[PDB]
Design a protein around this ligand. Structure first.
Ligand SMILES: CCCC[C@@H](CC)COC(=O)c1ccccc1C(=O)OC[C@@H](CC)CCCC
Length: 297
């Protein structure tokens, strides 16, 4: 419950759009150098979405143990990140679960704005549902994402029924869910825990079209008043993350809507930890993912 010691060390030791994207990529590949991912067979590809081609990467496990494709949406505040920044997480998800994983390079803001990545993420999920029989898998997919990518996975899940899209589960890793309400964790951990109040504002300015967008349910899936019938859900939070309370409240709300829900707070942890392989909690959370999906298919 105190701040993990390795996290403390991490936090102690630490301007242009293109080069802000760059330092994000460099921070990521620096973590991967320090703690290399397992080897995994991949193949690049493209998906035709209603907003353009979107690059994807398919991960193939050494040993296929799971009978649904995972579709992973990377985080980074809708502004940063890509297939490469999240390779360390996706590689381990692929090998630990023994699932084929579709990692998605959706359109980043501010070039694309809300709700372009929502539509594209829906299109890729539909693509994967269509391909699944030909991979030898069940047609129902698992959607998954971290932070901003958890937001997308949550919106995709809520829109699944309307869009005739089969989803077997949703893995939300410290997701952003509510852009309207100021929770206690948002106030208590506003500064100093990697993800900051000022950054969250800036991401919002880049992603949304106008301030009114914050209350739209495809920006804020938490405001959706009827969560009955949604995909079984694994919701992971970090204790010391401003996003913690919305994530946890959402899992509570799903539980009360009859949705089979597993809720896990990682104590001592901060936002982003599932892409930070310097922390052993990253692999623990990946084992949590593998255990949860055993209870699915
Ligand atoms: C090896 C991979 C490198 C990246 C890794 C750190 C080394 C993880 O970083 C993060 O998770 C992260 C860090 C800073 C800013 C944003 C994020 C992020 O994903 O979500 C931002 C949230 C803001 C609330 C979107 C909500 C918009 C209202």
């Amino acid at each position: 419950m105190p701040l993990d010691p390795r996290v403390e060390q991490f936090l102690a030791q630490m301007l242009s759009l293109a080069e802000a994207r760059q330092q994000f990529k460099q921070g990521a590949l620096l973590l991967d150098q320090m703690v290399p991912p397992p080897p995994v067979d991949t193949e690049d590809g493209t998906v035709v979405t209603t907003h353009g081609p979107v690059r994807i990467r398919r991960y193939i496990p050494d040993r296929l143990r799971f009978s649904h494709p995972l579709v992973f949406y990377h985080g980074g505040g809708f502004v940063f990140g890509d297939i490469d920044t999240h390779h360390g997480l996706v590689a381990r998800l692929c090998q630990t679960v023994g699932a084929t994983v579709i990692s998605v390079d959706y359109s980043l803001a501010p070039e694309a704005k809300f709700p372009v990545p929502v539509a594209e993420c829906i299109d890729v999920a539909r693509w994967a549902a269509h391909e699944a029989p030909g991979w030898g898998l069940k047609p129902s997919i698992v959607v998954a994402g971290d932070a901003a990518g958890g937001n997308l996975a949550a919106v995709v899940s809520q829109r699944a029924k309307d869009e005739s899209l089969p989803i077997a589960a949703q893995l939300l890793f410290y997701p952003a869910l509510d852009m309207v309400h100021e929770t206690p964790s948002k106030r208590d951990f506003a500064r100093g825990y990697l993800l900051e109040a000022d950054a969250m504002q800036w991401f919002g300015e880049q992603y949304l079209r106008t301030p009114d967008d914050v209350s739209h349910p495809w920006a804020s899936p938490a405001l959706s008043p009827d969560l009955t019938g949604l995909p079984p859900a694994l919701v992971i939070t970090a204790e010391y993350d401003p996003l913690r309370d919305e994530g946890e409240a959402y899992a509570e709300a799903l539980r009360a809507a009859g949705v089979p829900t597993e809720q896990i707070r990682f104590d001592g942890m901060i936002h982003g930890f599932m892409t930070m392989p310097i922390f052993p909690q990253m692999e623990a959370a990946i084992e949590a993912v593998a255990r949860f999906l055993e209870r699915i298919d």
